A paper describes a structure:
Peptidyl-prolyl isomerases (PPIases) catalyze cis/trans isomerization of peptidyl-prolyl bonds, which is often rate-limiting for protein folding. SlyD is a two-domain enzyme containing both a PPIase FK506-binding protein (FKBP) domain and an insert-in-flap (IF) chaperone domain. In order to improve our understanding of the mechanism of SlyD and of FKBPs in general, we set out to analyze the kinetics, energetics, and structural basis for substrate binding and inhibition of SlyD from Thermus thermophilus (TtSlyD) using 15-residue-long unmodified peptides, which we reasoned would be better mimics of natural unfolded protein substrates than the traditionally used 4-nitroanilide tetrapeptides. In total, we obtained five structures of TtSlyDFL and three of TtSlyDΔIF at a maximum resolution of up to 1.4 Å.
The highest affinities were obtained for the S2 peptide with KD1 = 0.161 μM and KD2 = 2.97 μM, followed by the S3 peptide with KD1 = 0.869 μM and KD2 = 22.94 μM. Furthermore, there is more than one molecule of TtSlyD in the asymmetric unit in several cases, which for TtSlyDFL:S2 and TtSlyDFL:S2-W23A display substantial differences in substrate binding. Moreover, in the case of TtSlyDFL:S2, there are two TtSlyDFL molecules in the asymmetric unit (molecules A and B), which bind the peptides in very different ways. The resolution of this structure is, however, rather low (2.9 Å), and although the electron density map clearly shows that the peptide binds differently to the IF domains of molecules A and B, the side chains are poorly defined for the peptide bound to molecule B. The S2 peptide inserts W23S2 and I31S2 into the binding groove of molecule A, whereas it appears to insert P29S2 and F32S2 in molecule B. Interestingly, the proline residues of the peptides bound to the IF domains are all in the trans conformer—with the possible exception of the S2 peptide bound to molecule B in the TtSlyDFL:S2 structure, where P29S2 could be in cis configuration —and in most cases do not form direct interactions with the IF domain. The S2 and S2-W23A peptides both bind by inserting the side chain of P29S2 in cis form into the center of the binding pocket. The binding mode is the same for both TtSlyDFL molecules in the TtSlyDFL:S2 structure, whereas the S2-W23A peptide binds in two different ways to the four molecules in the TtSlyDFL:S2-W23A structure: one similar to the S2 peptide (molecules A and C), and one in a different but partially overlapping fashion (molecules B and D). Two peptides, S2 and S2-W23A, adopt β-turn structures with a cis-proline in the i + 2 positions. However, our results speak against such a scenario, because both type VIa1 and distorted VIb β-turns are observed in our TtSlyDFL:S2, TtSlyDFL:S2-W23A, and TtSlyDΔIF:S2-W23A structures, which strongly suggests that FKBPs can catalyze cis/trans isomerization of prolines present in (at least) both these two types of β-turns.
Author numbering:
A (entry chain A): 1 to 150
B (entry chain D), C (entry chain F): 20 to 34
The structure:
């Protein structure tokens, strides 16, 4: 069964950036519902169960550019009383919009905390070692939710 | 994308 | 306009 629209696809992957093996593991996604990054999805289109291949994914087809306006300074007092506010620490910001958006703490300087709203990989080119583990049809529930069942 | 906007009342939680 | 979604797998940021 070939990877295509509405197929639930399971992959084993290895993520590299400039030679650094950042992440490894296994996931399943619903194909053709914008759940996986475009580049890696385009590379998976038509593939059979068992196939192994490599994929280079530019930022454009990964997590996009790195907007410098995404880098803002916020007061240290705005953080939870008993939370470690250090570089790499992840939190959430929320306002009247009612939309929680995630951030990574970049630097802490006195009462000024520099945070980054960009995706951690925004601006990077990703290299992938991919193995197509399994390809099955999606259930009605899955199609209804537009996501694979974890 | 995206910025912070004090023209509301932005807060931060650590879940 | 053009938006990139930070919640896309494999590296999910948020939810
Ligand atoms: Cl999914």
């Amino acid at each position: 069964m070939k990877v295509g629209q509405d197929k639930v696809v399971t992959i084993r992957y290895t993520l590299q950036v400039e030679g650094e093996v950042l992440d490894q593991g296994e996931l399943s996604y619903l194909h053709g519902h914008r759940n996986l990054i475009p580049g890696l999805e385009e590379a998976l289109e038509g593939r059979e169960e068992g196939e192994a291949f490599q994929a280079h994914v530019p930022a454009e087809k990964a997590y996009g550019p790195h907007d410098p306006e995404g880098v803002q300074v916020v007061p240290l007092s705005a953080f939870p009383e008993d939370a470690e506010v250090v570089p790499g620490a992840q939190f959430y910001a929320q306002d009247m919009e009612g939309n929680p958006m995630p951030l990574t703490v970049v630097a802490v300087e006195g009462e000024e905390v520099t945070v980054d709203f960009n995706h951690p990989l925004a601006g990077k080119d990703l290299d992938f070692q991919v193995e197509v583990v399994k390809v099955r049809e999606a259930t009605p529930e899955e199609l209804l939710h537009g996501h694979a069942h974890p | 994308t995206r910025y912070w906007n004090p023209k509301m009342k932005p807060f931060i939680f650590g879940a």
